Each structure stands twice: as structure tokens, then as C-alpha cells.
Amino acid sequence: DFHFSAIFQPTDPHHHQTEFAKVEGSEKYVEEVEVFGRQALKVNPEALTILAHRAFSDVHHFFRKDHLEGWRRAIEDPEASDNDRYVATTLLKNACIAAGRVLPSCQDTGTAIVLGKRGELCWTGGEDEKYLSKGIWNAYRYHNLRYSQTAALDMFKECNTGDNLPAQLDLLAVPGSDYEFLFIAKGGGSANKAYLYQETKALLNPKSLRAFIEEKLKTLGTAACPPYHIALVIGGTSAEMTMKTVKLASCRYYDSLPTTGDKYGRAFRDPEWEKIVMEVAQKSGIGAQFGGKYFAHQARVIRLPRHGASCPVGLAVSCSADRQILAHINKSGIYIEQLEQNPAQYLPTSVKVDLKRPIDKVRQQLSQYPVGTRVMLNGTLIVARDIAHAKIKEMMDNGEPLPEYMKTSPIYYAGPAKTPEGYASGSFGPATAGRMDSYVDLFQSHGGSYITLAKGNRSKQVTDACKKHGGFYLGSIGGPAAILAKDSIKQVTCLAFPELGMEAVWKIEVEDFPAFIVVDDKGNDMYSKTLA
């Protein structure tokens, strides 16, 4: 009466539907042997370094077809808003710049994540984590990427690791003699939009689930640079299993799962509720960052078994920097997923704001316009994000004044990637505004941060602060870090806190920097209707 049923039963477990390229000459890293009558593969662990290096290089300059098709759909759909088409066009042009292999597609070159599946008889010598980490180290050190990892020296004392390590290395033991991989360069902002809900059987009916989806999609907001790949996982054997599943679903790793359940509790994709997620996303009006239809590229919904007392639910997105690559090592060598090298084939007024004026004159000009107005910024921005804000608040709590450089220019929340030789700037797109919300009222009450520039919707405290203090929040397009660096950023200099690395305070000169007035000085917020 015993019947074993694996939870996950993909019809394409080795991902034959994906196109792979062989690393030339890589069959020299492997050797087929036989021990105790069974076939085994000896793998020179230097293959893991080579593979990880190429994976975490390529993934920053090219995209998958299904991601690029979504941007074209947003341009060509008659039901797309004008802002949908504008944002999607910008992202596609950004992808064309990134395809030049110098600038990465986003300044947040992400956390390096490796899902590895080592066959029982795949023999590497066992130092996989070291050799994989060396390849990741190579990719981030020898390319114009960014060191984004923050080490905790104690509970509160932190420093940048300076090399984008440690990686997340999830190496699984599986049958056979091959080594299969999914590499993910996961941005922090989209990682932050991975949510776990602890629900109950009372959720599991059509009316309750639909209302739940409507409520939760809004909480994603625009803070992870939509259009999104939206993944929703209902059920799971534990919270951590639910969240791992929703991550992998967002990477389309589970696309070949069955579409029906059975009495053994196997996982399945639910295309009907995928359609419902897309309808909710489209009718939400949130759009591709600034109102419209293209909140989402596509949706994945995976229904899981559950303990009768339990119903964990995971919701997560893949963002505009949709960065994963499949790979495998076998008797023939090293194979890596082929991404789209020619994104250009998918490619079918505003207010000039002079920032080279007194900030009060800039505030006066912005006050003339409603939320949703598109602006083009020309002049100096002061760049500061999470740690700089915390240090400055800490200074003020010790009686120190708000520094003068926080009062002369708009504050751009951003952290740049490394600058290529001969370039004015590396990739340099915006950070999530909402993480700095707790500082705006304080800084504005001390005569600074009257104008901020970042991406994402903000909390009500920021709307109230801008109305109280005559302030503004400007929304940059989120994601197009390469085209901003190439076309808009003309000069970059470190102004304060150099030891923070990318989180130092910078002074940058920009030209033709596009943004929308998201919050004005009158209590208005262009997200108040769609994200209420």
C-alpha cells in the first residue's frame, strides 16, 4: 500500500526546453569512470569556478526571451498606458546598452545564489563551495559589477565585504552522475518583495482567495521595478519550503510541473489562478511603475500540499533585473543557458528642471505642477542611501547639525556599480525610496532633503512631511541603470563617508535625467488611487 510520490514532478526535469551553449573545450574537465558496476563522472572542481564566473558575468548583460517579450508586449499592446510604453521602451533600451558587455543592466548586481544538484556519482573532490565562490569572486572583481554584501561584525556594527561574498550556495544531493545548476543574481529590492503569510483553510475558496490576491498584490507596489514576474505559492510543508518554492517559481524553474493534483499531494501549476493573478494585476491600474496595465509580465501559481492545521502562502517577484541562468556539467563538458544577445530586435512632453539654482527656486518650480508630471533634471544630485541616512541621523541625535550637503541639492537614493575605464560612471540607477521614509520628516524639519529622487511608492508619513515642509518626492524609472549611466550621468565624485563603498555620499552631475513627480507639496501622491 506504500506509494512514493515526489512533491515536484516536472515533465522536463533537465530543462530540455532551454537552449544551452557548450563551453568550448570543457570536456577536458570531466572523465567517465566505473566503480562497483556503476557509471560515475570525475569533475575537476575548476569547472565549477569557470562555470560560476561565466554565469555571473553573462547574466548581467543579457535577458531571456520571455522577459524581453513582456517589454515588447507593453510597447505594442493598445491597452498599455502611455507610461507603460515609455517605461518598457526605456528598459529595452537599457537592455541594449547592457548587451554591450561593459555596463551591467542594473547597478544592484545582486546576491549571488547557486542552486546546485550534484549526482550521487558526480565526484568533484568535495570543495564545491570554495570553487563556486572563487568563480563568483572572479565575476564581481574583474567586471564592472558592485559589491553589495554587508557583513555583521557584531549585531549592529557592519562593513561591506568588498567582494560580493558570501554567496548563497544550496547544493542538493540527487541521483545520477551529473551536476545541474540554477544561478541567480538576485537584486536586494526584489528579494525584499518576498512575503510569507500564515493563512488557514478559511482562505481556500474562490471568493476569499481572489480577495486575498487583490489585497496582497498592492503591497508589492512599484518598489521592485515592475513589470513583475509574479509568483504565488499556496501551501507547503514549511515556511522555508514555501519561500524556496516561490523563489524558484519566479525564476520559471517549475514551469514544466503538472497542472493537476492527486491523492498523493504532488505540487502543480494552476493556470486558471495564474490567469486570475494576471487579471488582478492588469485591472489594478498600477501599471509598469507609473500607472497602466503592465504591473506584471506573467504569473506562476503553484499549489502545494499542507499539514491540515497549516496554510503557508508565499508571494514574490522577479524584477526588471530578471537574472537567472541554467547550467549543467556532464560527460560532454560544461553547458550554460543561452540568453538573448540581440535585445534590439524586440524594440519596435516633459518639464525641464534646472537643479543648478537655489533649492528654493527648484521647489517653487515643482510646486507649479501636479503629481504624475514628467520632469527632466539637469544639475547636481547628492547621493545617499541607507547607511548614510542612519549615520547622519545618528550625528543629529548626538547634537550635530544636519550636514550642509543635504540641503543644497535634491537627495538621490542610489548606490553605483564600479566605473568602467574611460566612463564617467558605472551603472547608477535608483534605490527603493521606502527604506528611507523614516528620515524625511526629521531631515526636512532641519532644512534638508526637501527634494528626494528614488523609485517606489512611499508611506503616508512622507506625503505628510512634504505637505508640511514644502517638499517633493520624484520617482525615477526603476531598473535602467546602464542607460542612465551612459546618457545622463556626466560626473561622479565622492563627497563624504568614503569607507562605505557604494554607500558613500556622492556628488553627481546629471543631464536629461527623467523622473515623475510622485509626491508634491500639497498632500497629493500619484499612487494614492492604485496603491490605496
Binding site for ligand SF4 (CB under 6 A): 106, 108, 110, 187, 189-190, 224-225, 319-321, 429, 478-479
Alpha carbons 404 and 230: distance in angstroms, whole number = 42
The interface partner of residue 198, options being a second copy, ligand SF4, none and the CB cut-off 5 to 8 Å by kind, is a second copy
Min dist CB 112 to a second copy, Å, is 9
Which residue from 310, 324, 320 is spatially nearest to 196, judged by alpha carbons? 310
Least Cβ distance, residue 199 to ligand SF4 (angstroms): 17
Distance of CA 6 to the CA centre of its chain: 31
525 Cα distance to chain centroid: 24
Q: Which is nearer to ligand SF4, 224 or 339 (CB)?
A: 224
Cα 371 from Cα 462, distance rounded (Å) = 14
Neighbours of 507 (CB within 10 A): 18
519 - beta bridge partners? 473, 525
CB of 160 to a second copy, least distance (A): 7
For the bound state, the minimum distance from the C-beta of residue 367 to ligand SF4, rounded and expressed in Å, comes to 29
Which residues have a C–N gap over 2.5 Å right after them in the chain? 348
Q: Which entry of a second copy, ligand SF4, none binds 174, CB below 5 to 8 A by partner kind?
A: a second copy
**Measured at CB, which residue is nearest to ligand SF4?**
187
Q: Considering beta carbons, is residue 41 or 377 the nearer one to a second copy?
A: 41
Cα 125 off chain centre by? 34
Beta bridge partners of 380: 509
Q: How far is the CB of 107 from a second copy (least distance, A)?
A: 11
Tell me whether residue 92 or residue 411 sits nearer to a second copy (CB atom). Answer: 411
Determine the 3-state secondary structure of 520 from DSSP.
Answer: coil
108 vs 520, beta carbon nearer ligand SF4: 108
Nearest to 102 by CA among 401, 485, 371: 485
Which residues, including other chains, have CB under 8 Å from residue 24's CB and lie 6 or more apart? none
Considering the complex, state which of residue 344 and residue 494 has its C-beta at the smaller distance from a second copy: 494
* CB closer to a second copy, 17 vs 205: 205
Choose the contact partner of 405 out of a second copy, ligand SF4, none; CB within 5 to 8 A by kind.
none
Q: Min. distance of Cβ 103 from ligand SF4 in angstroms?
A: 13
CA–CA separation, 164 and 170 (whole Å): 17
Which residues, 6 or more positions from 74, have their beta carbon under 8 angstroms from its beta carbon?
A: 80, 84, 85, 87, 88, 227, 288, 293, 294
Question: Min. distance of Cβ 445 from ligand SF4 in angstroms?
Answer: 29
Contacted entry of a second copy, ligand SF4, none for residue 448, CB cut-off 5 to 8 Å set by kind: none
Q: Which does 156 bind (CB under 5 to 8 A by kind): ligand SF4, a second copy, none?
A: a second copy
Residue 403: contacted member of ligand SF4, a second copy, none (CB under 5 to 8 Å, by partner type): none
